[PDB]
Amino acid sequence: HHQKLVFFAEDVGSNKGAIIGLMVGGV
Amino acid sequence: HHQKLVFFAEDVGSNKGAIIGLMVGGV
Amino acid sequence: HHQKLVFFAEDVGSNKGAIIGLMVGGV
Amino acid sequence: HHQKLVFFAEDVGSNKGAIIGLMVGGV
Amino acid sequence: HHQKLVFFAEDVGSNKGAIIGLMVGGV
Amino acid sequence: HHQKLVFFAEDVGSNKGAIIGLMVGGV
Amino acid sequence: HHQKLVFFAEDVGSNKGAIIGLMVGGV
Amino acid sequence: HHQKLVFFAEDVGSNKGAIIGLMVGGV
Amino acid sequence: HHQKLVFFAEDVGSNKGAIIGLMVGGV
Amino acid sequence: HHQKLVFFAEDVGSNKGAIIGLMVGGV
Amino acid sequence: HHQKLVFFAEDVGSNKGAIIGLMVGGV
Amino acid sequence: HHQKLVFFAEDVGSNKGAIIGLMVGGV
Amino acid sequence: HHQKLVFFAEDVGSNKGAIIGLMVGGV
Amino acid sequence: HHQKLVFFAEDVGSNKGAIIGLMVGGV
Amino acid sequence: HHQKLVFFAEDVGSNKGAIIGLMVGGV
Amino acid sequence: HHQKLVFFAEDVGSNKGAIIGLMVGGV
Amino acid sequence: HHQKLVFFAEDVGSNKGAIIGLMVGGV
Amino acid sequence: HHQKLVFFAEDVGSNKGAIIGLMVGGV
Amino acid sequence: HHQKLVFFAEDVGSNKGAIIGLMVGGV
Amino acid sequence: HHQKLVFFAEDVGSNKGAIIGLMVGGV
Amino acid sequence: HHQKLVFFAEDVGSNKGAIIGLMVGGV
Structure with missing residues (x-):
C-alpha cells in the first residue's frame, strides 16, 4: 500500500x- | 493499492x- | 487498485x- | 506501507x- | 512502515x- | 534641444x- | 526642439x- | 518503522x- | 543641447x- | 525505530x- | 552640452x- | 531506538x- | 561638456x- | 538507545x- | 570637461x- | 545509552x- | 579636465x- | 551511559x- | 588635469x- | 596634475x- | 605632478x- 496526502489552505501560491518575466529599457 | 489525495482551498493559485510575460521599452 | 483524488474549492486558478503575455512600447 | 503527509497553511508561497526575472537598463 | 510529515504554518516562503533575478545598468 | 536615440538589433528581447509565471504541483 | 528615435530590427520582442501565465496540477 | 517530522511556523523562509541575483553597473 | 545614445546588438536580453516566476511542490 | 524532529519558530531563516549575489561597479 | 553613450554587444543580459524566482518543496 | 530533536526559536538565522557575495570596484 | 561612455562586449551579464531566489525544503 | 537534543534560542545565528564575501578596489 | 570611460570585455559578470539566494532544509 | 544536550541562549553566534572575507586595495 | 578610465578583461567578476547567500539545516 | 551537556549564555561567540580575513594595500 | 586608470586582467575577481554567507547546522 | 595607475594581472582576487562567512554547529 | 603606480602579479590576493570567518561547535 502507498499513500500521499497534500493539503493547501486558504491563500497558497497566489499573486497579489x-x-x-523580462524587462528591457533604454535611456 | 495506491492512493493520492490533494486538496486546494479557497484562493489557491489565483492572481489578484x-x-x-515580457516587456520592452525605448524611453 | 489505483486511486487519485483532487479537490478544488472556491476560487482555484482564478484571475482577478x-x-x-507580451508588451512592446516605444517612447 | 508508505505514507507522506504535507500541509500548507494560510498564506504559503504567495507573492505580495x-x-x-530579468532587467536591462541603458541609463 | 515509513512516514514523513511536514507542516508549513501561516506565512511560509512568501515574498513581500x-x-x-538579473540587473544590468549602463549608468 | 533634447535628443534620445535607441537601437535594438536582431533577436533582442526575444524568447526562444x-x-x-506561476506553477503549483501536488506530486 | 525635442527628438526621440527608436529602431527595432528583425525579430525584436518575438516569441519562438x-x-x-499560470499552471496548476495535482499528481 | 521510520519517522521524520518537521514544523515551520509563521514567518519562516519569507522575504521582506x-x-x-546579479548586478552590473557602469558608473 | 542634451543627447543620450543606446545600442543593443544581436542577441541582447533574450531567453533561451x-x-x-514561482514554484510550489508537495513532494 | 528511527525518529527525527525539527521545529522552526516564528521568524526563522527570513530576509528583512x-x-x-554579485556586484560589479565601474566607478 | 551633455552626452551619454552605451553599447551592448552580442549576448549581453541573456539567459541560457x-x-x-521562488521554490517550495515538501519532500 | 534513535532520536534527534532540534528546536530553533523566534528569530534564528535571519538577515536584518x-x-x-562578491564586489568589484574600479574606483 | 560632460561625457560618459560604456561598452559591454560579447557575453556580459549572462546566465548559463x-x-x-528562494528555496525551502522539508526533507 | 541514542539521543541528541539541540536548542537555539531567540536571536541565534542572525546577521544585523x-x-x-569578496571585495576588490582600484582606488 | 568631464569624461568617464568603461570597457567590459568578453565574459564579464556572467554566471556559469x-x-x-536563500536555502532552508529540515533534514 | 548515549545523550548529548546543547543549549544556545539569547544572541549566540550573531553578527552585529x-x-x-577578502579585501584588495590599489591605493 | 577630469578623466577616469577602467578596463575589465575576459573572465572578470564571473561565477563558475x-x-x-544563506543556509539553514536541521540534522 | 554517556552524557555531555553544553550551555552558552549571553551573546557567546558574537561579533560586534x-x-x-585578508587585507592587501598599495601605498 | 586629473587622471585615474585601472586595468583588471583575464580572470580577476572570479569565483571558481x-x-x-551564513551556515547553521543542528547536527 | 594628478595620476594614479593600477594594473591587476591574470588571476587576482579570485576564489578557488x-x-x-559564519558557521554554527551543534554536535 | 603626483604619480602612483601599482602592478600586482599573476596570482595576488587569491584564495585556494x-x-x-567565525566557527561555533558543541561537543
Whole structure:
C-alpha cells in the first residue's frame, strides 16, 4: 500500500503584487 | 493499492495582481 | 487498485487582475 | 506501507511584492 | 512502515519585498 | 534641444525557450 | 526642439518558444 | 518503522527585503 | 543641447532557457 | 525505530534586509 | 552640452540556463 | 531506538543587514 | 561638456547556469 | 538507545550588520 | 570637461554555476 | 545509552558588525 | 579636465562555482 | 551511559567589531 | 588635469569555488 | 596634475577554495 | 605632478584554501 496526502489552505501560491518575466529599457 | 489525495482551498493559485510575460521599452 | 483524488474549492486558478503575455512600447 | 503527509497553511508561497526575472537598463 | 510529515504554518516562503533575478545598468 | 536615440538589433528581447509565471504541483 | 528615435530590427520582442501565465496540477 | 517530522511556523523562509541575483553597473 | 545614445546588438536580453516566476511542490 | 524532529519558530531563516549575489561597479 | 553613450554587444543580459524566482518543496 | 530533536526559536538565522557575495570596484 | 561612455562586449551579464531566489525544503 | 537534543534560542545565528564575501578596489 | 570611460570585455559578470539566494532544509 | 544536550541562549553566534572575507586595495 | 578610465578583461567578476547567500539545516 | 551537556549564555561567540580575513594595500 | 586608470586582467575577481554567507547546522 | 595607475594581472582576487562567512554547529 | 603606480602579479590576493570567518561547535 502507498499513500500521499497534500493539503493547501486558504491563500497558497497566489499573486497579489507584480510578476514581470523580462524587462528591457533604454535611456 | 495506491492512493493520492490533494486538496486546494479557497484562493489557491489565483492572481489578484499583475502578470507580465515580457516587456520592452525605448524611453 | 489505483486511486487519485483532487479537490478544488472556491476560487482555484482564478484571475482577478491582469495577465499580459507580451508588451512592446516605444517612447 | 508508505505514507507522506504535507500541509500548507494560510498564506504559503504567495507573492505580495515584486518578482522580476530579468532587467536591462541603458541609463 | 515509513512516514514523513511536514507542516508549513501561516506565512511560509512568501515574498513581500523585491526579487530581482538579473540587473544590468549602463549608468 | 533634447535628443534620445535607441537601437535594438536582431533577436533582442526575444524568447526562444520557456517562460512560466506561476506553477503549483501536488506530486 | 525635442527628438526621440527608436529602431527595432528583425525579430525584436518575438516569441519562438512557449509562454505560460499560470499552471496548476495535482499528481 | 521510520519517522521524520518537521514544523515551520509563521514567518519562516519569507522575504521582506531585497534579493538581487546579479548586478552590473557602469558608473 | 542634451543627447543620450543606446545600442543593443544581436542577441541582447533574450531567453533561451527557463524562467519560472514561482514554484510550489508537495513532494 | 528511527525518529527525527525539527521545529522552526516564528521568524526563522527570513530576509528583512539586502541579499546581493554579485556586484560589479565601474566607478 | 551633455552626452551619454552605451553599447551592448552580442549576448549581453541573456539567459541560457534556468531562473527560478521562488521554490517550495515538501519532500 | 534513535532520536534527534532540534528546536530553533523566534528569530534564528535571519538577515536584518546586508549580505554581499562578491564586489568589484574600479574606483 | 560632460561625457560618459560604456561598452559591454560579447557575453556580459549572462546566465548559463542556475539562479534560485528562494528555496525551502522539508526533507 | 541514542539521543541528541539541540536548542537555539531567540536571536541565534542572525546577521544585523555587513557580510561581504569578496571585495576588490582600484582606488 | 568631464569624461568617464568603461570597457567590459568578453565574459564579464556572467554566471556559469549556481546562485542561491536563500536555502532552508529540515533534514 | 548515549545523550548529548546543547543549549544556545539569547544572541549566540550573531553578527552585529562587519565580516569581510577578502579585501584588495590599489591605493 | 577630469578623466577616469577602467578596463575589465575576459573572465572578470564571473561565477563558475557556487554562491549561497544563506543556509539553514536541521540534522 | 554517556552524557555531555553544553550551555552558552549571553551573546557567546558574537561579533560586534570588524573581522577581515585578508587585507592587501598599495601605498 | 586629473587622471585615474585601472586595468583588471583575464580572470580577476572570479569565483571558481564555494561562497557561503551564513551556515547553521543542528547536527 | 594628478595620476594614479593600477594594473591587476591574470588571476587576482579570485576564489578557488571555500569562503564561509559564519558557521554554527551543534554536535 | 603626483604619480602612483601599482602592478600586482599573476596570482595576488587569491584564495585556494578554506577561509572561515567565525566557527561555533558543541561537543
